[PDB]
């Protein structure tokens, strides 16, 4: 309920906090503003939309403006010269118990943790970026964890499904390419499956609702570098961080308000 | 660091050692020469090239010239009548711990060991050659080993993924065919996955960077026989042998210099 | 060696034994005759042919003539009014230890055992025939057995891979259809993988040579019935039965002579 | 452990550095970018590619910017007024052993260091330096010299040849040409041979087994004063000397190791 609390997007350390005021957006989505004007601040969207018939989506965008003086006037107009668009339509179950979403929430914070894969990849912007990595999607805590390795490499578009079948494990996809004369994209689809209401496979399973389709389109301009890209990552993880309104909504099978 | 040490390519036994002096090649690659002229010696390349966005490659070639008097002059011109081209663009992770590459290094020496599959196959040149075999890719030592059997046989182009999912195990491919009036090829792709920073699946996994695409194109001329082909194999294994500069580079996520 | 011994094809019980004299066939194949003329007897072929480059085949045919008076003369000409053609190009490894083939031999006798799947299916000719069944391919004996269930059903052409990956388990296929105005076929491909030189996954694996492609084309005429079809099955199992020359060859990675 | 990282290059006295970090490789084309601002960054490329069946070609371009200030529209936009284009294509055959490339690199980079008769042209008036005569270039210890005499210029294309034998001579070019109305392009190719012996037909014909192709196209605008070129040359030649992170790849395994 009303998880609209002013949470810090980028946990830099206290200085220059990208603190974002909640409560906003029109026709079905969410928002979280930072302390500046309508051209240099950070955008943080999050909408709930019943994708199909048994699987509801979660469109969640997050902008990462480059805080630099505009080069089109020579005045003090605060605006970004380029932005790091972060899209992610995370599908999800609904009639399953509350602990099912916790499994998917950790499946988002664990995807971006301090000293982990993607977070330290897209952060250097080059000797590592774009996408395909590994991480225990569900960080349960010593027992019940989900391991997930890789295999195929067709046309440079990978697809990884966990320690189960090619039709019953935590799958994730992606791809990068120079779409035009200036930008690039990170189509990191993270189809997060659900496996809750269970101890360790103790029959009391009766789970419900099938999958999620976390399709992502992270456009990163060629004007970025190492430093500005670590900020892009901190925007992705500071998005789905425990206790924050973005993942907490996705935790109770609920929006925000 | 500077793994450029004179290592013996073919471990024949001391006589006629194909010892190769290191330190060479232009515009991004490596070399290791043998004691002769520029037409009968053995070539041993190895380049590092960031294939995509999160997966860096390892183009590694190795020539196997037939030490026979040239049949185009009747003089003492030392040159090969035919060569056994060995190509292998081995992709790989980078921001993962040093022990991740050890897993992939053994995944190359174990692929060619004394009294094993491929090494005793391509060696007889006929009742066994070309490709598709098995071997514990990662030779850990009694615990944590990776078993990997087979299944499909579509159009004669096999694909084998290990004891996991069709999207999360050690996969490898290949194929052979008479490309022209005189040569043949061994398109032995060995897509080596990574699974490090872990005991035996003890949660402390947090691994990173996805897969490798060790595409291979081993062209073997129809003028070869049993004896000259064992030398071709010893060139493949003496390439990725522990302690040698080729796999040692691939062991520390590094080149040579 | 010289496994050419007079083995009984159909184990009926002693009466009317389809005993077959060995030692025959031209240009690369085998034969086993029964006590009659060149038109009513049973044919039992078996050829060895290095299919590709690392996988050698085993073309094995077996005819099942209907012992009835010819309806084209009214004389005592002994000949079949229709035949049950049994084809099966079983690929296989060679440089692997002798116990690897034992695993594939049992993978043929277990495929057709007394009171099992296929044997009791094609035997009734109707409430059960054609193909897709299950059986522990490798009948080891209490430990190390290979379980294998099913899943897909696309266009009525099934494909079953065992308790491993979709690229590393005992796969098998098939299909039936009215090819023309009078006959039908059983395209029962049994791609038998190999998994030998091992206790129970104890590291000492170092196995070699990849797969087998036991493609089958069992043409059964629409003039058959329940009784004549049990004889068709007994011809398939009496073919790959332990101790007999057909599977014993396939047991030592050898032909017969 | 990560190769292809932030390295060092062109410098002068103690004021501004040029750390060249990584950036892109899409479709096989390495690329390095420097500091914060891309419009003032030092781009550089590198890609492996086997041209045919008896050669190995490369591509290492280089764009050297200018820390200028284009004020258009009242804004001081930090952008380069021009960029360099040191593109060195090098073909190395398979027959050429691992002892030719080491002496090829020191012949391409070891051709234009910081005033050699060819690159002094790239740093001063005498872009010939000598009324264009027999000069010195690539050398090692005391045995063979490489005096490069003059030869042709037909249609605006300088050319230098060495000693007696042309088939073993060191070709080099140079031509002035204003590309448009605000620029001045150039072309300085370089072919480095090999003192080998092609015996075909019973005759020892002294000919090169391969040749280099150091082709540096450089565009210098009219607006760019006579104080930019001096620092451009030491940035093109002063980019690949004898082991720099870019040319060490042209001399060893290390792409940017």
Curated annotation (Swiss-Prot), chains A, B, C, D:
One of its GO terms (molecular function) is RNA binding. Its main location: virion. It comes from the Viruses. The keyword Repressor does not apply. Residues 31-232 are annotated as: Viral RNA-binding. SUPFAM superfamilies: RNA bacteriophage capsid protein. GO terms for biological process: negative regulation of viral translation; regulation of translation. Keywords: Capsid protein, RNA-binding, T=3 icosahedral capsid protein, Translation regulation, Virion. It is found in: Virion. GO terms for cellular component: T=3 icosahedral viral capsid. Gene3D superfamilies: MS2 Viral Coat Protein (3.30.380.10). The keyword Lipid biosynthesis does not apply. It holds the Pfam family Levi_coat. Homodimer. The capsid proteins form dimers that assemble by group of 5. Twelve such pentamers are linked together with free dimers. The homodimers binds to the viral RNA via an operator hairpin, but also to many other RNA sequences in the viral genome; this interaction probably shifts the virus from the replicative to the assembly phase and ensures specific encapsidation of the viral genome. Capsid protein self-assembles to form an icosahedral capsid with a T=3 symmetry, about 26 nm in diameter, and consisting of 89 capsid proteins dimers (178 capsid proteins). Involved in viral genome encapsidation through the interaction between a capsid protein dimer and the multiple packaging signals present in the RNA genome. The capsid also contains 1 copy of the A2 maturation protein. Belongs to the Leviviricetes capsid protein family. This is Capsid protein. The lineage of its organism: Viruses, Riboviria, Orthornavirae, Lenarviricota, Leviviricetes.
